[PDB]
């Protein structure tokens, strides 16, 4: 905590389930945002920090909480982005062990996201500190003294804080999206790498240049798309549609009607086909005639 280590996160397809996987991970709290949306969030210049905490004051480590470690060793701005993740590192850090010293002596509280890297004997008292440590003059660092016996308190708990930077540049850190399977030869709606459309998808004989990804017809409507996952070029055709027209001899001369399905094979859209769903179009037993 006295001298924490910073990291920069960029061009990252980041999944947060891997952190969820580890069982010693017991602190998933995020003061800033709900973890449910966390994976779907898109960010850039994400910055993370890690340190060694007794775990008794981990509540003080939360933003807006005050403690001697929060006073000197570590600082968290009250406004928070990301999550504070703490897991019990008693397996490793315990043994006691005195390497990871933490500073409990400094002139003033540190500003948000500020490093206190240099240790100078603390002149808490009025007398000058000249002459190394002395009365009212103490070394800032204190041994963390991780004895394995001390279980309830000051036990080894590893805490790491995630901080998210808010879209200063175009976002470069996001989660995995657009992951479902592929189907063909059916009236379906698709989102091909953000290209949202609806139609029957089929393989195409068209030839795309390597940088080409979609193709449009004369009317500038998307008529072919290259699959993102597979380099296959798939043709898109709109789902079958057309006008319906009704032939009647007149209400008073009978009530039977004849339905004309304009400009479509009888085969593609038989009585099986919804729009006018109560119309069963009678049945195939009823005479079906194909005209131009």
């Amino acid at each position, epitope marked *: 905590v006295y001298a924490w280590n910073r990291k920069r996160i960029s061009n990252c397809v980041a999944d947060y389930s891997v952190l969820y996987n580890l069982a010693p991970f017991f602190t998933f709290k995020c003061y800033g945002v709900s973890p449910t949306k966390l994976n779907d969030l898109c960010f850039t210049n994400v910055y993370a920090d890690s340190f060694v905490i007794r775990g008794d004051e981990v509540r003080q480590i939360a933003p807006g909480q005050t403690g001697n470690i929060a006073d000197y060793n570590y600082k968290l701005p009250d406004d928070f982005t990301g999550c504070v993740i703490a897991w019990n590192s008693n*397996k490793l850090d315990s*043994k006691g062990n*005195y390497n990871y010293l933490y500073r409990l002596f400094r002139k003033s509280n540190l500003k948000p996201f500020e490093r206190d890297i240099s240790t100078e004997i603390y002149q808490a008292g009025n007398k000058p500190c000249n002459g190394v440590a002395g009365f009212n003059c103490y070394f800032p660092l204190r041994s963390y003294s991780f004895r394995p016996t001390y279980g309830v308190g000051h036990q080894p708990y590893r805490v790491v804080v995630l901080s998210f930077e808010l879209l200063h540049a175009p976002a470069t850190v996001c989660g995995p999206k657009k992951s479902t399977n592929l189907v063909k030869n059916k009236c379906v709606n698709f989102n091909f790498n953000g290209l949202k459309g609806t139609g029957v998808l089929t393989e195409s004989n068209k030839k795309f240049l390597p940088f080409q990804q979609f193709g449009r017809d004369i009317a500038d409507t998307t008529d072919a798309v290259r699959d993102p996952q597979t380099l296959e070029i798939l043709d898109i055709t709109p789902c079958s549609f057309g006008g319906v027209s009704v032939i009647t001899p007149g209400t008073n001369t009978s009530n039977q009607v004849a339905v004309l399905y304009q400009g479509v094979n009888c085969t593609e859209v038989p009585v099986a086909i919804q729009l006018t769903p109560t119309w069963r179009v009678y049945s195939t037993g009823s005479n079906v005639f194909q005209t131009r």
Partner: antibody
Amino acid sequence: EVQLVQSGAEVKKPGESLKISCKGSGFSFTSYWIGWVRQMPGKGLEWMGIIYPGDSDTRYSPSFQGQVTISADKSISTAYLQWSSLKASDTAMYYCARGGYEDVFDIWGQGTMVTVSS
Amino acid sequence: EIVLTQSPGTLSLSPGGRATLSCRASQSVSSSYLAWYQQKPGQAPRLLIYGASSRATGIPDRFSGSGSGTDFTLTISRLEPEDFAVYYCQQYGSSPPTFGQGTKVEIKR
């Protein structure tokens, strides 16, 4: 107190498994990293590996990695080094001592003499 | 990896004197806090001094660790009769630890 009572010495021909049993007492088996150390007669000690009973996280010594099998049981708090089978060269003084990645001696067991001969 | 030569192999001196436990290392590892273990003949070794030079709990002050890097030394200011035993040095904070070859104490022959 915290003492690691080891199994008694054994004599056996090569080719059989020997689950040497080191019993630890006076401490939480989970809370502490245990481990094994081997000594050839007249040679310095060497590290065989360290096992974490809490997660059974067993880091074997690379030179002895896979050569022998080290295990333990939390319920009885006894180390169970299966040692795989037994080789004639494996006759040695094996101490079971509490130690971790920091490699502290903590408590050293009395040790067990394993003799492998015809 | 690090090979610890416990030079000299054997020390022959009068009781109560000081000695040098020169644990020469292949590479300089002071952060490893190399540990000296005292093994009595027919006894489980006892860590003489841990933390490079930190005093192991329940150890007489006549022992004193010192040195750094590739050269670590232990000086036993008052060589007591019980101190006549085998001494090892082992890398402490490093990757899979290796004990030294040993060092013995003697008076006459």
